[PDB]
């Protein structure tokens, strides 16, 4: 047992402290399953199993709402005790806002002291915050090996006249739907009163102009939802294309020495582009879908304070804009922007995972070379175009908001500078985003010319060596990649990492003192991504690499079920099947837990980051200009930590584009 996550004092459960002697022998030597520890008593298979079977006896004493409600009396407790976590953190994440509201008012009219109250409250928030989802996590995983047990104990029982697919995506993918539902379940029930007591503070703040800001900016939730709804329709509509030319590429790969032989390769080469050209006729709405959410979540907030600030200023003719006043409400527009974005999410995941457990029922009850060659397969144009317009629109956003300092003490003018501000950045990001869309689909379709054409010209031996899966998996599934996730990620992370340079360069303009100090932290940012990163990618190979043999011995179980009951061989394998989940089930608590560890160091960053820009700039001032320091401050810990995460997510999918070019290279017969 190595995962002492359980056994050890509140703090560094609530620190992941324990985890640092783990990470730092995972940077040495690398990680296997005699490193990894064995499964706690506590969360085991057959503990989780038996609390379920127990909790199923008490329903049963008292169906779709039947499993629910033995799901509720198993795991429960820790439910809510991670709701507790997360709602706590809800609220004291909504104490920052007023705080720098207090902060601002005192030194444009207590100023230190709040700044170490607000510090505090950070600290603790973000602790609190990052325990919620691990407590989300850890109970979504055990729900998954009592329910993965239990399906197994029931494909134990039925009987031959019954679909081995079924049950092995049924493991596959409904049990992922519900774990994910669990794991999405605090968000569910705190994202609700996170929005209300944000309306309510926005509203206290700032008068009746911040209903209507307030609004405008809940009016993103539907549109993402609907948007969300559009994307997996043309997701499955480009599922079709692709699974057709999938089966296409097979046909020309596995009869590939006929058609060399009487040289018939360049004709089924053509249908297969054909075919290419279909599914790109598709996933052009696709990308246009992505391109419009991404604009969305993006220029809702920045229309939502225009609208606010304006109105507030000239239409109602209401209050002057104060800098405390304005840059509480402009932090709490920040902190109201993410629960907005991702509950549409939830109630998906919802809906999702609600069908997945009817179903369950229903069943029971009867690299940077590839950086490089990529972003060369689009051309210096759409290169330049993009990184200017992710440059420029950073620019303005920065600029806006540091006319909203210059904004608050000819006010018509100011509000009309601003509005001019505030167009030119939605139409920036709007060009920031089309413009990644359409650098994704033309890399995509140079890439995958290229490839089916070189190896249309590779020699025979080449095939005969060669195993028929890899190259065939190389347009199976990392085309798919390069189609589907590449484009968003990439976004993301050039996102991430401006607003990330962004944040650090306003709170630097603002506090020339704090760069001394960003040097220090830096390298500790630096030091504690490394290390994160390799220990990520190992754990992170590891789980997948685990998944594998659980649904394999599925499959087994399905197929050969007469068998094994007439062997009465049952119980041992129950006992193989305990253990590949006891596996994954290891290898997953051990990559959330790295994960929380690093979410919770970059959160303990951000808040010291937070506490010497207040620090520094309350002394100076000792106005609007601290008001920008203080918010930009308060929240670089998001960008820091989603941008590490999408730096790991990006190295890995970045993997894809650089075997797809290593195999880009092979010999050509010169015909
Ligand atoms: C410009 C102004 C305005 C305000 C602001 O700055 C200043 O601008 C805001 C900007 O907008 C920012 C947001 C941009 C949008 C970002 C969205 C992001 O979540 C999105 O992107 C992924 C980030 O990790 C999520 O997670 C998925 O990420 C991918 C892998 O990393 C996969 O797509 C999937 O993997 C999993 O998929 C499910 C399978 O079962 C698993 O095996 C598998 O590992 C993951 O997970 C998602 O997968 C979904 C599949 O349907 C499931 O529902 C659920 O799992 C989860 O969802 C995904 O879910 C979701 O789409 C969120 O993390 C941060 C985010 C919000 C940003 C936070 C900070 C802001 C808000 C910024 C800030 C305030
Ligand atoms: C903050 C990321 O850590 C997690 C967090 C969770 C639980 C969780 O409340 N997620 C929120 C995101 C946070 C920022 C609110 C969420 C909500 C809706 C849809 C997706 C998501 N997401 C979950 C996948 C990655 C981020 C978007 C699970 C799993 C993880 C994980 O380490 O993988």
Redesign the pocket.
Same mark, same amino acid.
């Given at each position: 047992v190595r995962f002492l996550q359980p056994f050890v004092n509140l703090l560094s459960k609530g620190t992941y402290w324990w985890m640092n002697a783990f990470i730092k022998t995972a940077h040495k030597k690398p990680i296997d399953l005699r490193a990894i520890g064995k499964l706690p008593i506590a969360m085991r298979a057959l503990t989780n199993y038996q609390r379920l079977c127990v909790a199923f006896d008490a329903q049963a004493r008292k169906g779709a709402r039947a499993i629910w409600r033995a799901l509720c009396h198993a795991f429960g407790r820790r439910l809510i005790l991670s709701s507790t976590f =997360?709602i706590l953190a809800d609220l004291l994440g909504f104490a920052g806002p007023l705080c720098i509201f207090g902060i601002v008012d005192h030194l444009g009219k207590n100023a230190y002291v709040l700044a170490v109250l607000l510090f505090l409250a950070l600290l603790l928030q973000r602790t609190f915050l990052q325990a &919620?989802?691990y407590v989300?996590?850890e109970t979504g995983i055990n729900l998954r090996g009592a329910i993965q047990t239990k399906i197994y104990n029931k494909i134990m029982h039925l009987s031959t006249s019954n679909t081995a697919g079924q049950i092995c995506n049924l493991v596959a993918i409904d049990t992922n739907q519900l774990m994910?539902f669990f794991?999405?379940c605090?968000?569910l029930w705190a994202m609700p009163v996170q929005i209300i007591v944000g309306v309510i503070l926005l509203y206290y703040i700032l008068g009746v102009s911040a209903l209507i800001g307030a609004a405008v900016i809940i009016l993103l939730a539907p549109v993402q939802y609907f948007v969300a709804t559009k994307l997996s329709q043309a997701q499955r509509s480009t599922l079709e294309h692709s699974n057709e030319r999938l089966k296409q590429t097979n046909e020309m790969l596995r009869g590939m020495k006929l058609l060399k032989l009487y040289a018939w390769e360049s004709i089924f080469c053509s249908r297969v582009e054909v075919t290419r050209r279909k599914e790109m006729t598709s996933l052009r709405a696709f990308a246009v879908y992505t391109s419009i959410s991404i604009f969305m979540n993006t220029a809702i907030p920045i229309a939502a304070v225009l609208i606010t600030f304006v109105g507030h200023v000239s239409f109602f003719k209401e209050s002057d804009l104060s800098p405390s006043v304005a840059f509480a409400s402009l932090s709490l527009f920040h902190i109201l922007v993410?629960?907005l974005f991702?509950?549409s &999410?939830?109630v998906r &995941?919802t809906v999702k995972a609600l069908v997945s457990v009817q179903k369950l029922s229903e069943f029971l009850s009867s690299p940077w070379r590839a950086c490089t060659k990529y972003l060369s397969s689009a051309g210096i144009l759409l290169l330049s175009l993009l990184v200017f317009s992710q440059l420029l629109k950073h620019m303005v956003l920065v600029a806006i908001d540091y006319w909203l300092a210059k904004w608050t003490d000819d006010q018509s003018v100011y509000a009309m500078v601003f509005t001019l501000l505030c167009s030119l950045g939605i139409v920036l990001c709007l060009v920031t985003s089309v413009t990644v869309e359409w650098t994704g689909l033309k890399v995509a379709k140079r890439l995958h010319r290229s490839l089916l054409n070189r190896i249309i010209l590779a020699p025979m031996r080449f095939f005969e060596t060669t195993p028929l899966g890899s190259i065939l998996n190389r347009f199976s599934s990392d085309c798919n990649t390069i189609d589907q996730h590449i484009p968003s990620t990439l976004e993301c992370l050039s996102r991430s990492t401006l607003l990330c340079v962004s944040a650090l360069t306003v709170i630097s303009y603002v506090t020339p003192v704090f760069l001394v100090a960003l040097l220090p932290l830096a390298v500790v940012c630096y030091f504690i991504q490394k290390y994160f990163r390799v220990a990520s990618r190992d754990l992170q190979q590891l789980d997948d690499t685990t998944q594998l043999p659980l649904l394999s011995h599925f499959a087994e179980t399905v197929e050969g079920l007469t068998t094994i009951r007439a062997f009465r061989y049952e119980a041992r394998f129950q006992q193989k099947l305990l253990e590949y989940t006891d596996s994954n089930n290891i290898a997953s608590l051990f990559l959330?837990a790295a994960? =929380?560890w690093l979410?919770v160091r970059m959160e303990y960053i951000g808040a010291c980051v937070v506490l010497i820009a207040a620090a520094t700039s309350i002394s100076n001032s000792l106005a609007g200009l601290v008001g920008l320091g203080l918010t930009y401050a308060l929240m670089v810990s998001n960008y820091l930590?989603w941008m590490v =995460?999408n730096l790991a997510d990006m190295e890995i999918q970045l993997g894809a584009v650089k075997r797809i070019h290593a195999l880009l290279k092979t010999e050509a017969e010169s015909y």
């Amino acid at each position: 047992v190595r995962f002492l996550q359980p056994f050890v004092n509140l703090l560094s459960k609530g620190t992941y402290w324990w985890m640092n002697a783990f990470i730092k022998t995972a940077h040495k030597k690398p990680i296997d399953l005699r490193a990894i520890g064995k499964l706690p008593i506590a969360m085991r298979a057959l503990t989780n199993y038996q609390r379920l079977c127990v909790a199923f006896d008490a329903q049963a004493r008292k169906g779709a709402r039947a499993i629910w409600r033995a799901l509720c009396h198993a795991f429960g407790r820790r439910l809510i005790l991670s709701s507790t976590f =997360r709602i706590l953190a809800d609220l004291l994440g909504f104490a920052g806002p007023l705080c720098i509201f207090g902060i601002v008012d005192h030194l444009g009219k207590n100023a230190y002291v709040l700044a170490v109250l607000l510090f505090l409250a950070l600290l603790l928030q973000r602790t609190f915050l990052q325990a &919620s989802y691990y407590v989300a996590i850890e109970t979504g995983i055990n729900l998954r090996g009592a329910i993965q047990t239990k399906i197994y104990n029931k494909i134990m029982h039925l009987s031959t006249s019954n679909t081995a697919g079924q049950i092995c995506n049924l493991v596959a993918i409904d049990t992922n739907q519900l774990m994910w539902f669990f794991f999405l379940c605090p968000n569910l029930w705190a994202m609700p009163v996170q929005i209300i007591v944000g309306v309510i503070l926005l509203y206290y703040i700032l008068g009746v102009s911040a209903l209507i800001g307030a609004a405008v900016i809940i009016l993103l939730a539907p549109v993402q939802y609907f948007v969300a709804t559009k994307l997996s329709q043309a997701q499955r509509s480009t599922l079709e294309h692709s699974n057709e030319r999938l089966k296409q590429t097979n046909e020309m790969l596995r009869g590939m020495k006929l058609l060399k032989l009487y040289a018939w390769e360049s004709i089924f080469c053509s249908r297969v582009e054909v075919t290419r050209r279909k599914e790109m006729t598709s996933l052009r709405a696709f990308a246009v879908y992505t391109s419009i959410s991404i604009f969305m979540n993006t220029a809702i907030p920045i229309a939502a304070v225009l609208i606010t600030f304006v109105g507030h200023v000239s239409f109602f003719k209401e209050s002057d804009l104060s800098p405390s006043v304005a840059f509480a409400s402009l932090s709490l527009f920040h902190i109201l922007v993410t629960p907005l974005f991702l509950l549409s &999410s939830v109630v998906r &995941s919802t809906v999702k995972a609600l069908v997945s457990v009817q179903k369950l029922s229903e069943f029971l009850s009867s690299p940077w070379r590839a950086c490089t060659k990529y972003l060369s397969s689009a051309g210096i144009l759409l290169l330049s175009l993009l990184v200017f317009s992710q440059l420029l629109k950073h620019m303005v956003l920065v600029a806006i908001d540091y006319w909203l300092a210059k904004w608050t003490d000819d006010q018509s003018v100011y509000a009309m500078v601003f509005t001019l501000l505030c167009s030119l950045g939605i139409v920036l990001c709007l060009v920031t985003s089309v413009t990644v869309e359409w650098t994704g689909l033309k890399v995509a379709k140079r890439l995958h010319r290229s490839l089916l054409n070189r190896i249309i010209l590779a020699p025979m031996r080449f095939f005969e060596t060669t195993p028929l899966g890899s190259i065939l998996n190389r347009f199976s599934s990392d085309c798919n990649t390069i189609d589907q996730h590449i484009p968003s990620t990439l976004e993301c992370l050039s996102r991430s990492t401006l607003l990330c340079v962004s944040a650090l360069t306003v709170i630097s303009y603002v506090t020339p003192v704090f760069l001394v100090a960003l040097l220090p932290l830096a390298v500790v940012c630096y030091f504690i991504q490394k290390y994160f990163r390799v220990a990520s990618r190992d754990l992170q190979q590891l789980d997948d690499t685990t998944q594998l043999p659980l649904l394999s011995h599925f499959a087994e179980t399905v197929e050969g079920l007469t068998t094994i009951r007439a062997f009465r061989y049952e119980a041992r394998f129950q006992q193989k099947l305990l253990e590949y989940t006891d596996s994954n089930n290891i290898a997953s608590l051990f990559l959330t837990a790295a994960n =929380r560890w690093l979410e919770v160091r970059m959160e303990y960053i951000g808040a010291c980051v937070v506490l010497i820009a207040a620090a520094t700039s309350i002394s100076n001032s000792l106005a609007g200009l601290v008001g920008l320091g203080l918010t930009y401050a308060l929240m670089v810990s998001n960008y820091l930590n989603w941008m590490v =995460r999408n730096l790991a997510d990006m190295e890995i999918q970045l993997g894809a584009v650089k075997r797809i070019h290593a195999l880009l290279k092979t010999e050509a017969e010169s015909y």
